[PDB]
Design a protein around this nucleic acid. Structure first.
Lengths: 129, 193, 261, 154, 166, 49
RNA sequence: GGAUAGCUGGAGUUUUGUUAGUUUUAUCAGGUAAAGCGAAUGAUUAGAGGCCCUCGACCUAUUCUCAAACUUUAAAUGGGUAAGAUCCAGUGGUUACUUCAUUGAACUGCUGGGAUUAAUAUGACUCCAAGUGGGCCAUUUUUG
RNA sequence: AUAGCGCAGGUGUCCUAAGGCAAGCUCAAUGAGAACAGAAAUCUCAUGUUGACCAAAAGGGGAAAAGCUUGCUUGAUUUUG
RNA sequence: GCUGUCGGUCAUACUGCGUCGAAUACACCGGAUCCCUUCAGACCUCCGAAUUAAGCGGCGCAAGGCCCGGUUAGUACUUGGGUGGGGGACUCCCAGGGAAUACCGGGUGCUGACAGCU
């Protein structure tokens, strides 16, 4: 939104963000996809091994399979907020070839890291898997 | 015994000028700012060279007095008394404190003397003169730079006398918008009539 | 010398509102009248507005709103040629007759005519009367910037309203006859001081009696006849309500005019 | 330092420029029902009933209406907690708030929108939309070729 | 409105200014009483001077204001002392001229024992009709520049009326 | 042997550790309302019993 | 050195479409940074044009440079309030208050309309008591 | 909200009016005028956005007033929240 | 299209100077016996009815002022980041917000209630 952009201005130098693709979304939810399960208080963080976990929690909204998440995130459906907050945030390992220099922006000609890369976060995150 | 002027280089404090609150008046050493022929009209003396600071400083009143007496004496020998105007543009209004000799307590101090604050890109001196000269008038302000602290670039501007107008834009004079000494005044179509 | 009214004088210069500049409203006295507390919320404080112009006496009931003031019913002394009284429109008698003629057509508008007959002359009166019943219609008096002497015409029109049965709050102290004498006030309502001046002046002079009172000679009204009119006007009133260049130049047109000059 | 009812007021209580003289009469004819929002701005022209300096420019709820005053509940942080404080104030020093007036308009349209469906089966889900991303179209006009600028001193 | 634009004498004011308060002053007030037929007011000192020799609020001087029908008779007999002659200085910028006289003893009345000897200022005003508009309470305003009396307008009046020379 | 006169350091951090907001309640409290008004709310409430 | 509040622990409960050191939407308050002096106030350089000079006078239009205890104007960053189930509308009653008046006002009975009415995240009193009340440093702001 | 033996100053009072209310009036200053009279007395007109004055420091505020002048008075009273 | 009374915004509405205003109407204006006011019927008050000159209204002015926009300027300044630069004073890049005079293009009003008039 306009709201969620003006939040990200305040955080920029602790963050590297940008626009995903259908490859990197599929790779995240298959390889690193966990799902939060329980009442307010304790949710458990469960591994996505079968569709029956997804089915019971999001079967209100469509969204019976794991592949119907990938549509709802990539397209940004009407039920994005429900499907995103189902997913426990992803826990990526450190990138295989390293960062450049986390002081400086991805812009600047010192080739740093923080800030938003329009597309090139896809090349980063494919190494962090 | 006044201080060394390394003590009062930097603009550390807020301006503290001579007012009803300050009361201790030490009086300045420049009470003569303008020099050479003051009274020449604008149609004479088209050429010009400024002396411009690149550095954010204080400059003492004595250093301004020293520098104008340097520069106008170089004019008198080379190009005569009566083919130049030399303005000092900067004024010293900031008043400067000394504590002199339990160590503190009475730390706030009396007013020593006067000093002028100076920006980056700010104009200190300006010699207005004939286009014949100029090259002599630059070397008058290479001399006057040595009396100040820090560095000052010397800068031949493209402008007729002490005006806004470019010396291209002055001569297109004939049509008669322009008509006073040290100040070419623009006649407006604004009224009344 | 430096001379009057600099360029920088007009920069500083605040303006008074406009009806102070025009010289009409007192905004000091306006703020006192228009306030009606905040326990009342959205009641409307009515006020009688008596204004003495030349040749004419305007009389209005008015409440205030945010957009502007709002008139409930007007009255004029130029109406009174309807109800018997031909001439003498500016005087104290006509002021009483206007304030009475107003006060009926506040009540007739609301539908409150049979209640509040009031008290028909010149004796003192407030409305404490009528008990266990609907309270009389409250209305203040705004003089404006008429300077407030003993007598004047405005407290004529105040006493006209009190006869009519509008609840005006008033002390007695700025009536004529003051320590108070009621029958001296009766002389001013019925126009007896006007007749007594004509009675004094006619035996003295013909020339003053022609010069003044020329309309009285036309409309054929004698010194004896005056007290009959303003008495008989009242009964006529109380069976009655009311019953009906250069222009600007453009900037193309302005630079045209320069090259003429 | 020094503490007084009006310390450091100077600029804060200044009348304004060319704004001198008493309050106008139309601002004095505003009504304030209890259960209503008001911003407390104090004008130094009237010294009777002016609120304390801290409350100046604070929005809060009218709880009482005295005859020549308005009881406003405002709220105030004191380290660890907010506390709702009850301050009377003269009529001139209160403005009508305009903070609620989008929400007040909104409900009249929104409640009427839900009302009028009836048998079509409502479920409208009436909601503001925050202006995020734009969709795409072709665009075409006159062009200019720019380049970066060489330095000039002047 | 050529008939109503005619000049007329707006008012006449008379001012005796003395040393001290006492039987000096109240004697001099009785001169303006028997001349005019009106009791004077008494002015006071606004602040100390000391070289002349008065202090704050001493009650120094007196004056009186006369208007209409009486005011023509006092002015015509007053100018008979001066023999119908004044100066260029005497006429002000606003139009309202004036002059001085010594000796009320030779301006009617009688020299007396304890009335004594004084002079007076003798100041006039000249405006047209419609000068109500400045001074009235309701609906004030300036009398505008066309209607207002100049210096040179007042001289032409004084040449005709009373046969004066400037 | 001075010593520091005053400080606001670590005070925002202390306050935010716990800045409690009073719970909202239906029906406004009447403390400090007009006595004339609150007389007629008692006379009101009596008349419907 | 104490007392007092805060920070902390423990012991009990109440309780889950309510909370927020955040933004957005709409609305207010403010007089710092800069800017200003051919705008007031205060400081200030230069000449122009207004019985024989004469620098003066003062005025009129310009000009050089300024202000923690000057200001027409005026940012960024911060601060307030609001964004519905503790709501909205319709209609009757109570009242020593209020009104010229069932006119209002506040409180109440009933009858409709509406389930989360911006974004994102997320379950939210009472008692008893400890230690502590010498602080120091860094980036930016800043006083002697 | 915010410190220092930071900066510029102030208080331990004064007043039955300098309290209260209403009415009338407009102030400092400048300009041109009037016997004795001027650079300063008093009177008159014109202009006068506050440049005066409001007991006293400094700052807010004030023009048919909050200033000045007159009239009548004691709300500088009582009961406690 | 206008005039009056009570107003709203309170200079686009103020100030200066100059020309023109049908009809009501405001107004100047005539008088001092009573009501009432003073040195003074000028103000005020009362009783009147034998000229648009002013007030008042419209319009003009290469007018001042005021209001509005464009320049000035993505400049000054500034929030977050920097094992950036520089001996310091200060300055640059990245992610953001963003002024004010000077100076010339247009303006000089709009308006509610009530009673009347080509």
């Amino acid at each position: 939104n306009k709201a969620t952009i003006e939040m990200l201005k305040a955080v920029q130098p602790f963050i590297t963000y940008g626009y995903p693709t259908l490859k990197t979304i599929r790779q995240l939810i298959y390889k690193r996809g966990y799902a939060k399960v329980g009442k307010p208080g304790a949710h458990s963080r469960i591994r996505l091994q079968a569709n029956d976990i997804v089915s019971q929690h999001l079967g209100k909204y469509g969204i019976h399979g794991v592949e119907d998440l990938v549509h709802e995130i990539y397209t940004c459906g009407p039920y994005f907020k429900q499907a995103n907050n189902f997913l426990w945030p992803f826990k990526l390992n450190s990138p295989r070839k390293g960062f450049t220099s986390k002081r400086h922006g991805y812009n600047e000609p010192r080739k740093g890291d923080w800030g938003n890369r329009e597309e090139m976060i896809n090349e980063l995150v494919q190494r962090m898997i | 015994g006044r201080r060394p002027a390394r003590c009062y280089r930097y603009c550390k404090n807020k301006p503290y000028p001579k007012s009803r609150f300050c009361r201790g008046v030490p009086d300045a050493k420049i009470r003569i700012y303008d020099a050479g022929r003051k009274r020449a009209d604008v149609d004479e003396f088209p050429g010009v060279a400024h002396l411009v600071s690149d550095e954010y400083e204080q400059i003492s009143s004595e250093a301004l007095e020293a520098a104008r007496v340097c520069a106008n004496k170089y004019m008198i020998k080379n190009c005569g008394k009566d083919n130049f105007h030399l303005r000092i543009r900067v004024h010293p209004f900031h008043v400067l404190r000394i504590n002199k000799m339990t160590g503190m307590r009475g730390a706030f101090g009396k007013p020593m003397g006067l000093v002028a604050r100076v920006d980056i890109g700010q104009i200190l001196m300006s010699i207005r003169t004939r286009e014949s000269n100029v090259a002599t008038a630059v070397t008058a302000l290479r001399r006057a730079a040595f009396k100040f602290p820090g560095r000052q670039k010397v800068f031949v501007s493209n402008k007729w006398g002490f005006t806004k107008f470019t010396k291209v834009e002055y001569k297109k004079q004939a049509e008669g918008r322009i008509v006073d000494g040290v100040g070419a005044k623009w006649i407006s179509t604004k009224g009344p009539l | 010398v430096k001379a009057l009214k600099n360029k920088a004088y007009f920069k500083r210069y605040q303006v008074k509102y406009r009806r102070r500049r025009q010289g009409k409203t007192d905004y000091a006295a306006r703020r006192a009248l228009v306030l009606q507390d905040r326990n009342k919320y959205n009641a409307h404080k009515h006020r009688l507005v008596v204004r003495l112009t030349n040749k004419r006496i305007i009389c209005q009931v008015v409440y205030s709103t945010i957009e502007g003031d709002r008139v409930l019913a007007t009255a004029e002394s130029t109406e009174l040629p309807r109800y018997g009284v031909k001439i003498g429109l500016t005087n104290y008698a006509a002021a009483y007759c206007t304030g009475l003629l107003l006060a009926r057509r506040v009540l007739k508008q609301l539908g409150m005519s049979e209640t509040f007959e009031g008290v028909e002359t010149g004796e003192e009166y407030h409305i404490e009367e009528n008990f266990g019943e609907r309270r009389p219609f409250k209305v203040l008096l705004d003089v404006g910037i008429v300077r407030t002497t003993v007598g004047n015409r405005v407290f004529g029109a105040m006493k006209g309203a009190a006869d009519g049965g509008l609840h005006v709050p008033h002390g007695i102290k700025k009536f004529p006859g003051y320590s108070y004498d009621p029958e001296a006030h009766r002389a001013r309502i019925l126009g007896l001081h006007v007749a007594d001046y004509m009675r004094q002046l006619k035996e003295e002079d013909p020339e003053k009696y022609s010069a003044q009172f020329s309309q009285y000679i036309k409309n054929k009204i004698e010194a004896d006849d005056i007290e009959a009119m303003y008495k008989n006007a009242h009964a006529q009133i109380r069976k009655n309500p009311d019953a009906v260049r250069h222009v600007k130049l453009t900037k193309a047109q302005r630079r045209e005019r320069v090259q003429q000059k | 330092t020094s503490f007084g009812k009006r310390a450091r007021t100077r600029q804060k209580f200044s009348k304004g420029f060319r704004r001198h003289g008493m309050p106008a009469v139309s601002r004095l004819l505003v009504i304030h029902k209890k259960g209503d929002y008001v911003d407390i701005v104090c004008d130094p022209s009237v010294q009777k009933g002016m609120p304390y300096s801290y409350y100046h420019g604070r929005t809060g709820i009218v709880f009482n209406v005295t005859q020549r005053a308005v009881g406003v509940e405002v709220n105030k942080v004191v380290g660890n907690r907010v506390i709702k404080k009850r301050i009377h104030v003269r009529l001139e020093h209160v403005r009508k708030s305009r903070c609620n007036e989008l929400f007040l308009r909104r409900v009249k349209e929104n409640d009427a929108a839900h009302h009028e469906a009836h048998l079509k089966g409502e479920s409208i889900k009436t909601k503001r939309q925050i202006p995020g991303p734009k969709p795409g179209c072709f665009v075409s006009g006159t062009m200019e070729v720019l380049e970066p600028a060489p330095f000039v001193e002047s | 409105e050529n008939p109503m634009r005619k000049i007329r004498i707006e008012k006449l004011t008379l001012n005796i200014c003395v040393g001290e308060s006492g039987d000096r002053l109240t004697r001099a007030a009785r001169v303006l009483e028997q001349l005019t037929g009106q009791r004077p007011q008494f002015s006071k000192a606004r602040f100390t001077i000391r070289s002349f020799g008065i202090r704050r609020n001493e009650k120094i001087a007196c004056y009186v204001t006369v208007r209409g029908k009486k005011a023509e008779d006092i002015l015509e007999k007053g100018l008979k002392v001066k023999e119908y002659e004044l100066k260029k200085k005497n006429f002000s910028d606003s139009g309202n001229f004036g002059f001085g006289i010594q000796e009320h003893i030779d301006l009617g009345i009688k020299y007396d024992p304890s009335t004594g000897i004084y002079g007076m200022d003798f100041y006039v005003q000249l405006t047209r009709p419609g000068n109500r508009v400045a001074h009235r309470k309701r609906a004030r305003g300036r009398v505008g520049h066309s209607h207002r009396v100049t210096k040179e307008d007042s001289i032409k009046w004084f040449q005709q009326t009373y046969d004066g020379i400037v | 042997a001075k010593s520091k006169n005053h400080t606001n350091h670590n005070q925002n951090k202390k306050a935010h550790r716990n800045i409690k907001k009073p719970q909202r309640k239906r029906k406004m409290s009447t403390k400090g309302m007009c006595p004339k008004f609150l007389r007629n709310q008692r006379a009101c409430k009596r008349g419907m019993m």
